[PDB]
Amino acid sequence: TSRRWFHPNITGVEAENLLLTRGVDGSFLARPSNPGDFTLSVRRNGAVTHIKIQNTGDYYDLYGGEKFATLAELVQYYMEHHGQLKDVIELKYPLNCADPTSERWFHGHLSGAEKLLTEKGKHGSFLVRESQSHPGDFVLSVRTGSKVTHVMIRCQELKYDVGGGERFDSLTDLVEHYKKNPMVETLTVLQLKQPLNTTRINAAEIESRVRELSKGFWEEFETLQQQECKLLYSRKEGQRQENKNKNRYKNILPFDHTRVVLHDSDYINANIIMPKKSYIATQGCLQNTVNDFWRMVFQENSRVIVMTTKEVERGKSKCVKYWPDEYALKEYGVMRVRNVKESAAHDYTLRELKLSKVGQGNTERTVWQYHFRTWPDHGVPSDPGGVLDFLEEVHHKQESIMDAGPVVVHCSAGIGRTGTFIVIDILIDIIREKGVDCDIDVPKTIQMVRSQRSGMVQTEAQYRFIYMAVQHYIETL
Numbered sequence: 203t204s205r206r207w208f209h210p211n212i213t214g215v216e217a218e219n220l221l222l223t224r225g226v227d228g229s230f231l232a233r234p235s236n237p238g239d240f241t242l243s244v245r246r247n248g249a250v251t252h253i254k255i256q257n258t259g260d261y262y263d264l265y266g267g268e269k270f271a272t273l274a275e276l277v278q279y280y281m282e283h284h285g286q287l288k289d290v291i292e293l294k295y296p297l298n299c300a301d302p303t304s305e306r307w308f309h310g311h312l313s314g315a316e317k318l319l320t321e322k323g324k325h326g327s328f329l330v331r332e333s334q335s336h337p338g339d340f341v342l343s344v345r346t347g348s349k350v351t352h353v354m355i356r357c358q359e360l361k362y363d364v365g366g367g368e369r370f371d372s373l374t375d376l377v378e379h380y381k382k383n384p385m386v387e388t389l390t391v392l393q394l395k396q397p398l399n400t401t402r403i404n405a406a407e408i409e410s411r412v413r414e415l416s417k418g419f420w421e422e423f424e425t426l427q428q429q430e431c432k433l434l435y436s437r438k439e440g441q442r443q444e445n446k447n448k449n450r451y452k453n454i455l456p457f458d459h460t461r462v463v464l465h466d467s468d469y470i471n472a473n474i475i476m477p478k479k480s481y482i483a484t485q486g487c488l489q490n491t492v493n494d495f496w497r498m499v500f501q502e503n504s505r506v507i508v509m510t511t512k513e514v515e516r517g518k519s520k521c522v523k524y525w526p527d528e529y530a531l532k533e534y535g536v537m538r539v540r541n542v543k544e545s546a547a548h549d550y551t552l553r554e555l556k557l558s559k560v561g562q563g564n565t566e567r568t569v570w571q572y573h574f575r576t577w578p579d580h581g582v583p584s585d586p587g588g589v590l591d592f593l594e595e596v597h598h599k600q601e602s603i604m605d606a607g608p609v610v611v612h613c614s615a616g617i618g619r620t621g622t623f624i625v626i627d628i629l630i631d632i633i634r635e636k637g638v639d640c641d642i643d644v645p646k647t648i649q650m651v652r653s654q655r656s657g658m659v660q661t662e663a664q665y666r667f668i669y670m671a672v673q674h675y676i677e678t679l
């Protein structure tokens with residue numbers, strides 16, 4: 203599923219009309235509805251059924267169905283599990299979209315781009331802009347090296363062409379056709395390697411980009427959201443019968459190739475995040491997986507834990523208590539943990555824990571638990587100062603420990619708030635070491651982490667909050 207079934211700016215009225223006139227029974231599509239909710243419109247018996255999907259920051263909650271990490275994994279799960287979307291709603295045919303506003307190469311209204319392709323381009327860098335001469339047409343500009351070649355795209359009766367050959371129904375179809383079958387000039391091969399990178403900016407001009415995005419963020423986010431279809435890696439171990447009861451959410455599973463493997467069964471819903479600092483993104487402990495959680499902490503030689511949720515929020519359980527009370531001592535299987543001391547700030551609480559395996563004495567080490575408590579149940583924090591001060595302390599606690607393993611970060615499902623903290627921590631590590639003269643690329647970093655765990659960064663509110671945190675860290679330096 204190449205995300206073509208998601209229409210970025212279509213109304214519910216238009217969604218029904220597209221299914222009635224250009225779709226048959228079993229045809230479906232997705233659209234953004236309430237800012238933050240989505241809609242799954244499916245055709246059945248000549249009627250259209252609108253299923254609601256809510257995402258407050260933790261997961262995609264399909265009304266009357268299970269909870270998923272991405273909309274692509276949601277569509278994939280139901281296009282292979284017939285009879286589970288209820289009378290049954292079958293997902294057979296994706297009704298594809300033609301709006302190029304979410305494509306990386308589409309820049310819309312742009313002046314005759316020669317500067318952009320020169321100051322920030324390489325061989326194969328290309329873009330598609332609207333034509334300034336003939337209104338309605340488009341232009342495809344490609345850098346080749348040395349030179350910047352322009353190719354007209356004529357629009358004729360809701361179809362697109364480059365002056366000859368096949369007429370396409372979508373600019374995306376035209377671009378995808380010439381990415382594999384490049385145009386050869388009458389003397390040069392206009393290869394469409396990668397789209398022009400207009401998101402890599404200098405750390406000094408981050409405040410100027412936020413100003414341009416604030417009057418913007420939504421368009422860049424859904425451009426990253428469209429590329430999630432390239433991340434449907436296998437999650438087979440989590441689907442095994444022995445591991446079904448080990449996941450808090452049955453359909454939010456770790457990638458097979460990045461999962462943490464235990465050697466003491468070997469399953470735990472967790473993934474290694476590699477961007478010198480590395481991370482472990484996992485879910486909140488279940489009652490029957492606390493013993494496995496401390497197996498992972500001991501195995502990976504982790505000395506810091508970042509908890510970004512309360513045990514109970516909104517009356518619902520997010521994580522069971524896997525740490526002893528202050529001064530207590532508990533055994534979780536073969537692992538013995540003692541709560542040495544608790545230091546409480548405003549936004550968080552530090553818990554100095556000592557973890558060791560039973561029977562072996564010289565295996566003890568201090569594990570520093572950081573429990574962020576002031577995170578809002580609805581949305582993201584207004585000011586990033588508290589989170590920035592929280593991550594700054596966690597970083598210096600990590601750097602003071604020699605040969606310390608990865609940093610364990612978790613919330614509820616371990617993808618929403620967990621991905622936001624880890625991405626912010628990665629971007630700051632560049633600024634703290636390479637100063638302000640470095641380049642940062644927010645959507646590229648999120649895609650790099652989303653390939654290692656399904657659904658890192660869940661909402662646009664978190665996406666904009668990541669930009670605000672980076673901008674705030676610059677201005678206070």
Ligand SMILES: Cn1c(N2CCC(C)(CN)CC2)nn2ccc(-c3cccc(Cl)c3Cl)c2c1=O
Nearest residue numbers: 306308309398400421422425426429645646649
């Ligand atoms: C050029 N560009 C654009 N713009 C072209 C499209 C927009 C909407 C103008 N109409 C904004 C600028 N938005 N954008 C969002 C994410 C990524 C991205 C970056 C690196 C890797 C990957 Cl996988 C992705 Cl998805 C990009 C991007 O590269």
